[PDB]
Amino acid sequence: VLEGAGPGRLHGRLGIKPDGQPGYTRAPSPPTDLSMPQALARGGGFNLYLSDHLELDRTAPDARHASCRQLHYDLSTLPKASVIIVFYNEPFSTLMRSVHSVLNGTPPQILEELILVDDGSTLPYIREDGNQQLVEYLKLLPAKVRLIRNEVRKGIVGARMKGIRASRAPIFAILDSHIEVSPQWLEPLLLRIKEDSRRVVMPQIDGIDAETFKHIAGGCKLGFLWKLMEHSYEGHQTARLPPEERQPSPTDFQTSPAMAGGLFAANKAFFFDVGAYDEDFQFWGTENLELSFRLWQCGGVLECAPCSRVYHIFRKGDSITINKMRTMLWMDEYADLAWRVIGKPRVNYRPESLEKRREWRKRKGCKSFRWFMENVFPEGDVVTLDDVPYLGPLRNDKIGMCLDNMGWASPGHAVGLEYCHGGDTQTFMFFRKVGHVMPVNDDEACLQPSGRLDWCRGTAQFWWDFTSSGQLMFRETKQCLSAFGRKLRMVECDDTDPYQIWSWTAYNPPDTFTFPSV
């Protein structure tokens, strides 16, 4: 703690020079004649004119529910933590305001260090061979602020791993490079991990508008879509939770099948013991789901802490497919579904190093993905593959044509009727738990009686029954879909009408999933 430590400046007055002036020249108010789209382009998604005009010691509103402030933490018994902030070409104002925010709002007793990881930035203000603005300014901050560099941009996993391997505290908390904290953001995480070292605890994320920089209030539980990305519990999925967990208290810690932002705190030893990150994940993407799956299956738990809140400025290669293939290692027989949803790709997912993580999985004794679905994410639409009874073409023999979803990538999300070619654009799947008829390449798109695709919702407005006669019956209206006239229209159900009889391939996937060759 430097000179001037008090409430709102727990590490002292930051960024002040020997003569007493701040070490950072704040910009004047943004021009009155400033076009936002250009300003956002110049700022890489941020309003830099405004950010550069705001103070690094910026007050933020307490986003915590009032009840969170009725809690006490004994800082002498909590374990120290190491805050890690990775950044690639983060502008000075947002990076240092993130640092100031943490230092000002984190007691020195529980903050071992603050590690800034430069993941190969190229801006002149950061470079080793640049103008030295950043390094010079760090000299005006507590010595517990460190800077470490990657000479080449590694990506999410590589840069975080370097920061984690460099942290000395028993707990590390990973943040973003464009954040502001609510008060007492860290104390909840430390207390929860001290009581059980196997818990990875995520703060809840509020928002900072990228144009106005207004502070905005942010759920908790996250599922995943078969496109292999996290997705919040929809209304119909929280309705499947036990009644005690549907509407949880704001102070309650709540479990989550999946992580999103990448902001979390963990016991360093347990993190490495449970696999850390798969350091073959390239650039960015999906490392949060592989972590979430592996964590739960190998003895960990993932929790969200609503009394721990961080503001996040939301913005306005061939590695992405690889990252998904490697994540499918942890999905056992369900990878067949995931693999078909992302287009049956055949990439070089680096099989040699993935065998090693498979051998690691057994040696550790991790549980199965079926166990994960039945015990961690039983509210999902697909808990067993038996929940997807049809996958293939929806074909009307009478006219000799198939349902064509190629238009889901067109403004008019109209489903069509075309000669069958067997490609993915003519392949549909059925989720029986919700009656959804979707194309295999998007489980967020659902067939409507309008003959159009729209965003799936777990309601009666998307429920279809596939009858034993072959009819697609919209349950709400009890009408059936007909291909009469090469047009999609709803009609009275009548199993003698061949224009409303469809064939749909049953989905009987193998007991285990074999990876495609390279």
Nearest CB to Mn ion, comparing residues 283 and 513:
283
57 is in an annotated binding site: no
Is 381 an interacting residue with respect to Mn ion (CB under 5 A)? no
Residue 344, Cβ neighbours under 10 Å: how many? 11
Is 90 an interacting residue with respect to Mn ion (CB under 5 A)? no
Tokens encoding 345: 């790709």
Residue 157, Cβ neighbours under 10 Å: how many? 21
Single residue of 13, 58, 413, 433 touching Mn ion by CB under 5 A: 413
Residue 364, SS3 per DSSP: helix
Rounded Cα distance, 182 and 83, in Å: 15
65 is in an annotated binding site: no
> Which of the ranges 74-82, 194-202, 363-371, 413-421 carries the binding residues for Mn ion, by CB under 5 A?
413-421
| Residues paired with 76 in a beta bridge | none
Q: How far is the CB of 217 from Mn ion (least distance, A)?
A: 18
> Which of 83, 262, 103, 98 lies closest to 166, judged by CA?
83
Q: Calculate Rg over the CA atoms of the chain.
A: 26
Strands 199-208 and 215-216: antiparallel
Q: How far is the CB of 50 from Mn ion (least distance, A)?
A: 18
- Cβ pair 229, 443 in contact under 8 A: no
Residue 244, SS3 per DSSP: helix
Contacts of 252 (CB under 8 A, 6+ apart): 306
Nearest CB to Mn ion, comparing residues 236 and 367:
236
**Contacts of Mn ion in 199-238 (CB under 5 A):** 234
Nearest CB to Mn ion, comparing residues 2 and 225:
225
Tokens encoding 146: 């460190």
503 is in an annotated binding site: no
Nearest CB to Mn ion, comparing residues 72 and 214:
214
Chain breaks in the chain (C to N over 2.5 A) after: 218, 316
Nearest CB to Mn ion, comparing residues 364 and 413:
413
Q: How far is the CB of 388 from Mn ion (least distance, A)?
A: 18
> Which of 363, 370, 163 lies closest to 275, judged by CA?
363
284 is in an annotated binding site: yes
Q: How many residues appear in the chain? A: 518
> Which of the ranges 171-179, 205-213, 321-329, 463-471 carries the binding residues for Mn ion, by CB under 5 A?
171-179
Residue with the shortest CB distance to Mn ion: 413
Is 176 an interacting residue with respect to Mn ion (CB under 5 A)? yes
Task: Please give the annotated binding residues for UDP, written as ranges.
Answer: 86, 88, 119, 153, 176-177, 284, 315
**Residues in touch with Mn ion (CB under 5 A):** 176, 234, 413
Q: Which residues are annotated as a binding site for Mn(2+)?
A: 176, 178, 231, 234, 312, 413
Which segments are annotated as binding site?
86, 88, 119, 153, 176-178, 230-232, 234, 284, 312, 315, 413
